[PDB]
């Protein structure tokens, strides 16, 4: 789930 | 063959045996045979007749000049006649290094200084990271004004900071004229901080007025340019302290010093012509007949000339006869009336030798501004995270808030996270001023047989006025040590592998399973770990076998299958579970925190801060904004 | 709310909190009384006393 407000996966950088 | 001059000094007879001496001085490779000159008094005819006889009787390639007295109107001659007739020349101290901007056209100058408008980059980079910002300009009726006046504007709207300008004023402060406008046009003025250009006459006639009319006390800020504080070894009177100049470097090698970089930095410069054509140029020096169309042959050789480098200092001149990019050292005025280094300046980022700046009285008794703290910290992920300083524009980026690790020689660092925020807006509400610094002992706090270090250690030492950060509250802080309201809830909590029904399961509470030995977490020298101890003695005997490294290590031994159950804060335990590779999850969850406690602000006993920021932080807790930086920091996929 | 609602029947509370505030005793400005009352409170969460009372 890529919301537009804030996504965790969005605001903390990820690997893949 | 190169010439030295020397003038208007100590008779250095002796000097100039010892710069004749070195005939080889294996500075460079080859060394052309030096010859000295010296005039005995600084005159148009008498340095027109000495250079035109030398130049026309020894055949010279290029020539070194040494300064003077520190007068003007000496460098004009100088160009005039290195145009004329065409030999290098170059200015190496004294009033004779002045930057002389629009230069002869096809004069070869080459005066080793630093033109106003790095002086004021340099300046306004210490103003900024003072945060000042208040622009009283005071400039004198002198020929270089205007072109000062340009350049103060041209790099005010060359940065990031506002630079909100308050006043800028001309006065005639020369030999003669009305004391009292000036000294009326003095008396109404209010700005912390003060830019002066003028002359050194000027100088002391302006600083001796401004302490006339009460302008030189511990509230103000004076900066001027290396223009004037003249002889940089006789400071006179009536000179504030704390003077704040920018001088390049070499601001104390000695005279003979300075030769050997004025006949290296024309030797490596013939030498790096040689590599490329094999030859020296021939001396061109006519003062008779004056002869001479554009040559190409000196042309080119002067344009070889412009870079050199050597002995780990980069001298590049610009087209203009001045060096660009250049290391200038900060300079100001002790207590004790003598010039010393302050900060330094290399390659575009400023340092400083005190993380804030030390204000004296007329007694001495170096006074402390009261609206000003020191605030102890350091990094907890979730709530301070430190930063490098990006390579930029030296600064880091702006919503962040410079921090330095204490331990002279310094780092700056740049601090992030929660409670930095949360500092901020205190700041901004409580009218107050503050210096972050991390710690450097043990984390947050322990009593070694009365020796506390971290964050209690520091403030109940009085080394601090608050200890922000990741700090609970417990009974043994509190006695010795104040605390404000809480806005972080936290407490005990267990992590598990995705068994256990609290504390007081036999599971903890009787460590006498034959097979299976559960093991524990208890990151030790922390507050979790004095509470455990204290009231359950044979888990503290059990859980010696546990690993103990940081808050990241427990997670990849939990992931592997070494250890079974976590024991550690709350509000990190389940924030450290909301972003993780899978769903490692904990026990039954907010109904399963033990001791419940909250984060808060430590505070010297009997601070008068204590009861005004406290109702600013149930301010802050009660209309809301505690919870929009929780879903700006706090917040997780699982 | 929730004693009620998980009390007597056919309750329930809806979502959950929305503004979280603690509870505290109410003391008259600069009481001498309250660096003790707050030590008390402090040690009595600690000690396990308060888990004990709530879930009595
Ligand atoms: C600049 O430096 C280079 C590197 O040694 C040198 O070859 C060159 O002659 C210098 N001057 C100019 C104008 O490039
Ligand atoms: C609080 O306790 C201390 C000792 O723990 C005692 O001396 C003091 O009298 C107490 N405060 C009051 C207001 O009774």
């Known amino acids: 789930r890529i919301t537009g407000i804030n996504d965790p996966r969005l605001r903390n950088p990820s690997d893949k | 063959t190169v010439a030295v001059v020397f003038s208007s000094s100590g008779p250095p007879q002796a000097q100039f045996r010892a710069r004749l001496t070195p005939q080889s001085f294996l500075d460079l490779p080859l060394e052309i045979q030096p010859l000295t000159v010296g005039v005995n008094t600084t005159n148009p005819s008498s340095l027109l007749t000495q250079i035109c006889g030398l130049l026309g009787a020894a055949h010279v390639h290029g020539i070194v000049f040494e300064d003077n007295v520190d007068t003007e109107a000496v460098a004009q001659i100088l160009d005039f006649i290195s145009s004329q007739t065409h030999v290098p020349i170059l200015s190496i101290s004294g009033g004779s290094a002045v930057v002389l901007t629009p230069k002869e056209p096809g004069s070869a100058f080459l005066q080793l200084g630093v033109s106003l408008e790095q002086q004021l980059q340099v300046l306004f980079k210490v103003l900024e990271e003072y945060d000042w910002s208040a622009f009283a300009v005071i400039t004198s009726l002198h020929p270089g004004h205007a072109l000062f006046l340009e350049g103060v504007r041209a790099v005010a709207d060359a940065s990031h900071v506002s630079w909100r300008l308050l006043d800028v004023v001309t006065l005639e402060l020369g030999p003669g004229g009305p004391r009292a406008r000036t000294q009326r046009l003095l008396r109404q003025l209010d700005a912390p901080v003060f830019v002066a250009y003028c002359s050194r006459e000027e100088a002391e006639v302006l600083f001796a007025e401004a302490a006339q009319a009460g302008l030189v006390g511990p509230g103000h800020v004076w900066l001027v340019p290396n223009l004037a504080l003249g002889s940089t070894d006789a400071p006179p009177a009536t000179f504030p302290v704390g003077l704040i100049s920018v001088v390049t470097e070499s601001w104390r090698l000695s005279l003979r010093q300075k030769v050997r970089d004025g006949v290296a930095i024309l030797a490596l410069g013939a030498h790096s012509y040689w590599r490329q054509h094999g030859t020296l140029p021939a001396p061109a020096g006519d003062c008779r007949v004056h002869p001479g169309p554009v040559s190409p042959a000196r042309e080119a050789f002067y344009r070889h000339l412009l870079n050199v480098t050597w002995e780990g200092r980069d001298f590049s001149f610009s087209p203009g006869g001045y060096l660009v990019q250049p290391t200038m050292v900060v300079i100001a005025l002790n207590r004790h009336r003598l010039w010393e280094m302050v900060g330094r300046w290399e390659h575009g980022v400023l340092y400083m030798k005190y993380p804030v700046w030390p204000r004296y009285s007329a007694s001495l008794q170096p006074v402390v501004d009261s609206r000003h703290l020191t605030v102890a910290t350091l990094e907890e992920r979730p709530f301070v995270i430190v930063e490098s300083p990006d390579p930029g524009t030296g600064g880091c980026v702006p919503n962040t808030v410079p921090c330095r690790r204490q331990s002279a020689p310094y780092t700056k660092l740049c601090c992030k996270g929660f409670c930095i925020d949360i500092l901020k807006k205190l700041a901004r509400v409580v009218k107050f001023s503050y210096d972050l610094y991390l710690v450097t002992n043990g984390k947050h706090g322990k009593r070694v047989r009365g020796v506390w270090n971290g964050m209690i250690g520091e403030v109940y030492y009085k080394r601090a006025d608050m200890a922000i950060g990741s700090l609970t509250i417990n009974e043994e802080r509190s006695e010795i040590v104040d605390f404000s309201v809480p806005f972080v809830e936290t407490g005990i909590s267990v992590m598990v592998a995705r068994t256990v029904s609290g504390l007081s399961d036999k599971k903890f509470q009787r460590p006498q399973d034959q097979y299976p030995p559960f093991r524990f977490g208890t990151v030790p020298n922390g507050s979790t770990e004095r509470n455990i101890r204290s009231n359950y003695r044979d888990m503290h005997t059990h859980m010696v076998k546990f690993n103990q490294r940081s808050v990241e290590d427990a997670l990849t031994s939990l992931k592997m299958g070494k250890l079974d159950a976590f024991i550690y804060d709350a509000a990190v335990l389940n924030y450290m579970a909301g972003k993780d590779e899978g769903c490692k999850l904990v026990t039954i969850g907010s109904g399963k925190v033990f001791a419940t406690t909250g984060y808060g602000i430590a505070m010297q006993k009997d601070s008068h801060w204590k009861r005004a920021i406290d109702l600013a932080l149930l301010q802050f807790l009660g209309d809301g904004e505690t919870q929009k930086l929780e879903t700006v920091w706090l917040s997780g996929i699982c | ?56």
Request: charged letters at 30%; aromatic letters at 10%.
């Open chain 3, 1 to 56: 709310l929730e004693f009620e609602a998980s009390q007597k029947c056919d309750l329930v509370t809806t979502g959950e909190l929305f503004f979280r505030s603690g509870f505290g005793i109410g003391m008259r400005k600069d009481s001498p009384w309250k660096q003790n009352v707050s030590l008390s409170i402090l040690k009595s969460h600690e000690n396990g006393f308060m888990e004990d009372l709530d879930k009595t």
